[PDB]
Amino acid sequence: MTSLEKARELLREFPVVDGHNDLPWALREQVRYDLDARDIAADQSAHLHTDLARLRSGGVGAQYWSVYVRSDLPGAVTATLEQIDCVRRLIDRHPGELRAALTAADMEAARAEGRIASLMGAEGGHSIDNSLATLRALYALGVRYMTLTHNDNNAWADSATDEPGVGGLSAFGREVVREMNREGMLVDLSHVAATTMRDALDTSTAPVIFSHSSSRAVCDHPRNIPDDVLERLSANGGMAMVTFVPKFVLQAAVDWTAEADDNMRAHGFHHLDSSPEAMKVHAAFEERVPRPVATVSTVADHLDHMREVAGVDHLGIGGDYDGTPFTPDGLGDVSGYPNLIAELLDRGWSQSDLAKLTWKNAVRVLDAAEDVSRGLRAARGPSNATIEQLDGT
Ligand SMILES: CC(C)C[C@H](N)P(=O)(O)C[C@H](C)C(=O)O
Ligand SMILES: [Zn+2]
Numbered sequence: 001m002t003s004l005e006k007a008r009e010l011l012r013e014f015p016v017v018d019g020h021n022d023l024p025w026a027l028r029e030q031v032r033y034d035l036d037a038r039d040i041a042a043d044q045s046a047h048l049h050t051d052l053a054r055l056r057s058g059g060v061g062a063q064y065w066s067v068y069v070r071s072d073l074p075g076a077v078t079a080t081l082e083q084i085d086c087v088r089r090l091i092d093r094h095p096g097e098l099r100a101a102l103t104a105a106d107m108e109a110a111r112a113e114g115r116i117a118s119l120m121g122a123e124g125g126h127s128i129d130n131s132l133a134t135l136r137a138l139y140a141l142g143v144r145y146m147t148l149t150h151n152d153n154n155a156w157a158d159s160a161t162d163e164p165g166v167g168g169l170s171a172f173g174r175e176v177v178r179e180m181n182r183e184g185m186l187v188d189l190s191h192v193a194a195t196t197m198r199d200a201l202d203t204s205t206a207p208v209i210f211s212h213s214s215s216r217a218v219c220d221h222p223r224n225i226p227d228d229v230l231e232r233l234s235a236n237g238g239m240a241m242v243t244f245v246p247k248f249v250l251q252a253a254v255d256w257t258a259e260a261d262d263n264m265r266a267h268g269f270h271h272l273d274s275s276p277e278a279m280k281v282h283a284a285f286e287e288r289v290p291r292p293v294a295t296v297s298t299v300a301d302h303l304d305h306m307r308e309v310a311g312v313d314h315l316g317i318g319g320d321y322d323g324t325p326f327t328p329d330g331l332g333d334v335s336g337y338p339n340l341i342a343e344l345l346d347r348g349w350s351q352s353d354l355a356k357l358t359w360k361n362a363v364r365v366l367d368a369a370e371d372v373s374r375g376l377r378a379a380r381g382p383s384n385a386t387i388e389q390l391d392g393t
């Protein structure tokens with residue numbers, strides 16, 4: 001059989017646990033959670049990367065649904081609860097296809113019955129409003145990882161896409177990591193600065209993840225992971241879940257985006273300005289310099305290097321579907337994973353290597369978080385510390 005046929009067979013046995021899909025945010029923005037208007041039991045190809053049929057075609061057996069909210073708007077906690085509610089409603093609406101999962105055992109139970117294990121991950125520490133009790137409430141509601149920052153610094157952690165702030169984690173930032181360890185919430189180091197990665201690895205007593213980051217050595221962008229950090233994963237026990245975002249994984253796309261941003265500033269616009277006038281300027285740039293396109297090969301290049309440095313036991317996949325408008329060819333939506341697995345087969349990845357990448361590493365890591373939490377919950381009570389106490393006025 002072809003590599004693609006073999007890939008599908010392999011995924012039927014050990015499906016993908018995807019680290020980060022922004023369907024909830026897409027539903028929030030497109031239709032304000034009018035789920036009938038984007039029914040994922042029907043074909044949503046015109047609007048979304050994600051629906052149930054494409055998840056099945058793609059060999060997705062578990063999904064961390066992102067409950068991302070904007071850090072640059074007020075009411076982050078309320079919005080996070082709305083995102084969590086969206087995930088709950090999707091699970092309730094589609095019991096034939098989705099099963100809520102809170103634990104590694106739940107993931108295996110879902111796999112045994114052929115339902116997609118549905119977990120939640122918060123994307124940025126702003127979702128807890130500097131409140132450890134709020135962190136505990138998110139865990140109680142089912143959140144099983146939290147990205148420590150999004151694109152901007154928060155009061156206690158530095159983002160990779162912002163200027164240096166506290167220098168990694170502040171004292172309160174370390175307290176957040178300790179509390180996540182005690183609760184059994186995975187520390188997610190996507191988005192954070194390399195300093196923050198190192199501070200988190202110093203502090204965490206549980207395996208950490210990168211829910212959607214690729215390799216900085218392969219493509220130099222602050223959203224990707226440095227080799228020295230990848231090297232620490234085997235000792236920490238965690239995993240890096242490669243992402244597909246073209247402007248992170250393809251050198252030509254990083255360069256093009258930098259030039260596009262420079263061009264915007266040349267016209268007196270902030271690079272993120274979305275006014276009609278700014279859009280005209282960007283359109284003119286793309287007219288004379290077409291947007292480069294990544295491929296499955298681009299993503300496999302990251303995985304090859306990440307495997308060499310981090311080890312096969314420390315890898316996963318986090319597509320960022322519905323979180324990015326652009327995708328590599330062959331990975332245009334959630335049905336694409338078999339194309340990546342086929343490429344890896346062609347590059348000599350073994351069946352057991354691939355089962356770790358898709359399924360086994362993610363289950364091990366969540367189980368490990370539970371194990372560390374058991375010890376910490378027996379050893380001490382929850383923290384009552386405040387950011388004022390630990391970081392000062
Ligand atoms: C505004 C919403 C769509 C942002 C997404 N939650 P994101 O996952 O942070 C996508 C981005 C390319 C990244 O991961 O850096
Ligand atoms: Zn992200």
Ligand SMILES: [Zn+2]
Nearest residue numbers: 022066068323
């Ligand atoms: Zn996201």
